[PDB]
Design a protein around this ligand. Structure first.
Ligand code: NDP
Ligand code: NDP
Ligand code: NDP
Ligand code: NDP
Lengths: 263, 262, 262, 262
């Protein structure tokens, strides 16, 4: 019980890649046991368990599609069996689809709402009773600057992320007199596959295949620091929210965005 | 000579409450109006007559906004009867009060479907004509609950926050055009949606006393200690639809007696 | 007849720009108007005639809003000439562009004094009469720079943020009365305050090319790629002063071409 | 080996309350610390000893932050005793509760001077060294009152709103450097600044009952029904000063028991 989160059991959805893996790493570094998650029996990154287990805590991986409420429940029940009560829930799994509103596919709209907002509701609902019984909990929702402002061609995603922030506030208010907090982190751009795919698409469509020009234009359109936020930095924000100094941080956004929301 | 003369408006869920008040004010300002609700015969049998009193063309079309095909049928009906949809007011909406832990899955899905996704469907279906004609207004009826949270309203706060985010994106995609998209955020307004909540509170806490329950409900959130009216929400819709609001884009007009100010 | 018929309005700094545009729209809506600037002889010698074209009573009073005693003289003049101040528009404001490191101390103080503290002085002096009469409108001309920051505008963003916080408190202190207080937050409007900035940018970056400098200046911040007009800011003031805004309290009306939405 | 080892911090108004809590947390995290208040002999004779318990270099310098020449003296004292100022915490602040109508002109000016303008003076004096060194933290202690309004706190809400606006500008002017600027927004914390307000309420409304007044004061605004602690604010400052916060720029860290969430 030396490190700040020693003994706490965390679940990070969509932690085979990107921000989720970064968060899982930082939580383990801080002493938490961690359950990793994605859709596949074999993640594309075969080393994720080894990477997170390097910090001396207990780690598991469980394949579950967060768009299926029964699989969300399976992920929580597996954690309870393997490691113990879920004490830190990080709702992170998420997808993007870029399109003008007029031609935004109906199925893509529904999919983004299902994963990026409703899945967080399902998991939070499943975890809250145990947290209430134990008198402690953290629900950390990975929103976006796109939950606070709009961007062109991201209608479904901005809607889901705004919704996720509204959901965050309600959960925090319903738990405000308890040792359970609920907060959201709002990253600006982070160089993960979700962003790389977008930059590749505009590089081909607009910049003659020049990935450096496309990266600079994509980043600097929105982010005054003219640099990406890192997955380690988002993880550090998750560790902060999970720590005792954040016992009275409730229903808020921690924006880690290079200045995007400031202007 | 009226400020919206000749404009064709569609107001979803306009058989009752705020939607009907908006329709009334739009017609007072000279717009033709298509009213809408789920029923072949709305409960209020005089809604067409009440809105038609201001000398504009009025229609009613029954369509459930949770069904994309019926949203499309509403838009096509308007195009056929009155002409292109120029003012779209996404207003139909529902509430369900429950703690998060026991919030029914189907009730969450229903609230997201109507209070957020149906606005996406109707906006998607109306924007092409608006772009072709170079003018439009999309007015989304959000809530103070789209800006802050309240206990036992997780789905509704989520949907209304999401509706405001959607508003911003549509406004930005149209920012260099004659189309604007904005949201109105009312505080509490005394409609059946709120009356049913006050009844539940009166029965649980105040021995059925609606006078007492209404004041307790209102004063928990609304520093003016008075309700916002359907006419006031309609006046905000007229303002957003008028030429003075050509450069109001992607914003919230909050009409809430001070709720968000504190 | 007209919505503000007979109401007595004071618009500070209404010899130019947004203030004159607000005064014009308030007069068009039927209000009597007191115009105000620093000079006995405003640069624009025609302001009283331009505002008086709408058939209401118009006056001019020279007073520097940075001096509480001259604020009081303006209110007293209005009370003697036209009657009690019913609509107060706190609009006079200045700008100074500089990095924080070299921002002159006296310029910081001057911006705080005019763009924030003068609104407190005028509001304090007008509220007793509004309370005695059971009605009032205080309309504070803020900025998008009261909601977000921009480089090289530390004092102005501070003052305008402060003005928005002040607006909320005044609104909460009057929430159960017939007095409201709100702010309007324009984006860029083509006034001398902005033209001077565009001139500086042109010389620093665009070799004196006003057109190039004007498109760069706008499109850095304002997605509509067009200026907001003084008439549009005036129409927002009329809306806030009307009966449909009786329950709009402590809020911002953002008229900005999409700036705050992204 | 601790996360802020070797960094030199200055915390203004750190003889009491939140400022002392921040100083303690920064030192626990490895920072050298300069404490500050108005008095040659602070009321708490032990502040230096308490902060120095964590094995870092600690100093105290008496200076009134409303006087730009004394802000400069504090910075120059720090440079001489400990080295370049790397972490600046603008914390010193005062409160005055009064309705707007009777708010004393002098108390308004005093609150603006200390709660807003002093942060500008100290920031302006510290930035040049931070830019040369390529690293810095400016942490401004705002309030939930910088994000929303409360009755009878016009000057304070204005100043704290302005401080948040200033924070954004400084962060944008430094966004491509190793300097960040951010604000912490606490809800109610049980310091003398709050205890004096509760005593006023108790004597005015609860017949001297401090326990009743405390619960009413707290529960009107703060859904957690508990006070935030000076240690928690300090932990937020340590987080902002840490490497994980290198890309947190121009934002608010709100530590308020849910106040802004509703
Ligand atoms: N990158 C950025 O700039 C920003 C990202 N965010 C948010 O960060 C979060 C992570 O995104 P990021 O790391 O960027 O994107 P990545 O695509 O790198 O990671 C996405 C993660 O989600 C998992 N995943 C996808 N669909 C499902 C599903 N249906 N069920 C379970 N797991 C799933 C993937 O795992 P697998 O493929 O193994 O199933 C992967 O682990 C998202 O919520 C995103 O909105 C917020 C702000 C900025
Ligand atoms: N009342 C308040 O305090 C506030 C309300 N709002 C918003 O105002 C909007 C109107 O609500 P309000 O007037 O209060 O509530 P009402 O219940 O009074 O009106 C709801 C309207 O929606 C219609 N409706 C319901 N479901 C559907 C559907 N699936 N398809 C089409 N029409 C439908 C009803 O018509 P029928 O029954 O005839 O089908 C009725 O006309 C909602 O979006 C609500 O969220 C926002 C802030 C405050
Ligand atoms: N232009 C823009 O893009 C935006 C402007 N604003 C705000 O709009 C308001 C008006 O600015 P705008 O019209 O652009 O600026 P202008 O410079 O065009 O007008 C400024 C007005 O203030 C008057 N004035 C200046 N100092 C004083 C003083 N001490 N006492 C009394 N009157 C004074 C001037 O009158 P005289 O010289 O005759 O004394 C003039 O009428 C300001 O508060 C500004 O911050 C907000 C958002 C955008
Ligand atoms: N307490 C709360 O609930 C909240 C407080 N805050 C903010 O926290 C900060 C500290 O507040 P809090 O700790 O509560 O108040 P305290 O009154 O407990 O402490 C105030 C500190 O400021 C010092 N001080 C006062 N005037 C000056 C001056 N002119 N120059 C230098 N130092 C001065 C005092 O030291 P000395 O008397 O020795 O000079 C004391 O150290 C303030 O900015 C306040 O607005 C924000 C949110 C909530």
């Amino acid at each position: 019980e030396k490190r700040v989160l020693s003994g706490r059991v965390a679940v990070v959805t969509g932690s085979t890649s990107g921000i989720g893996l970064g968060i899982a790493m930082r939580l383990a570094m801080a002493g938490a046991d961690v359950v990793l998650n994605g859709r596949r029996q074999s993640p594309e990154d075969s080393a994720i368990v080894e990477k997170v287990a390097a910090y001396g805590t207990r780690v598991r991986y469980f394949a579950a599609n967060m768009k299926d409420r029964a699989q969300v429940e399976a992920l929580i029940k597996f954690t309870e069996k393997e490691l113990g009560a879920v004490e830190i829930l990080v709702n992170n799994a998420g997808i993007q689809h870029v399109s003008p509103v007029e031609t935004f596919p109906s199925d893509k709209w529904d999919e983004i709402i299902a994963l990026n907002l409703t899945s967080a509701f399902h998991a939070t609902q499943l975890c809250l009773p145990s947290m209430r019984q134990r008198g402690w909990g953290r629900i950390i929702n990975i929103a976006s600057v796109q939950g606070l402002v709009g961007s062109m061609n991201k209608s479904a995603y901005c809607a889901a992320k705004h919704g996720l922030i509204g959901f965050t506030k309600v959960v925090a208010l319903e738990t405000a007199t308890t040792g359970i907090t609920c907060n959201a982190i709002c990253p600006g751009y982070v160089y993960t596959p979700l962003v790389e795919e977008q930059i590749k698409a505009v590089a081909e469509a607009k910049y003659g295949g020049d990935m450096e020009a496309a990266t600079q234009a994509f980043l600097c359109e929105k982010q005054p620091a003219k640099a990406f936020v890192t997955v380690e930095q988002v993880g550090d924000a998750a560790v902060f929210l999970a720590s005792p100094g954040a016992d009275m941080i409730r229903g808020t956004t921690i924006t880690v965005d290079g200045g995007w929301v400031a202007q």
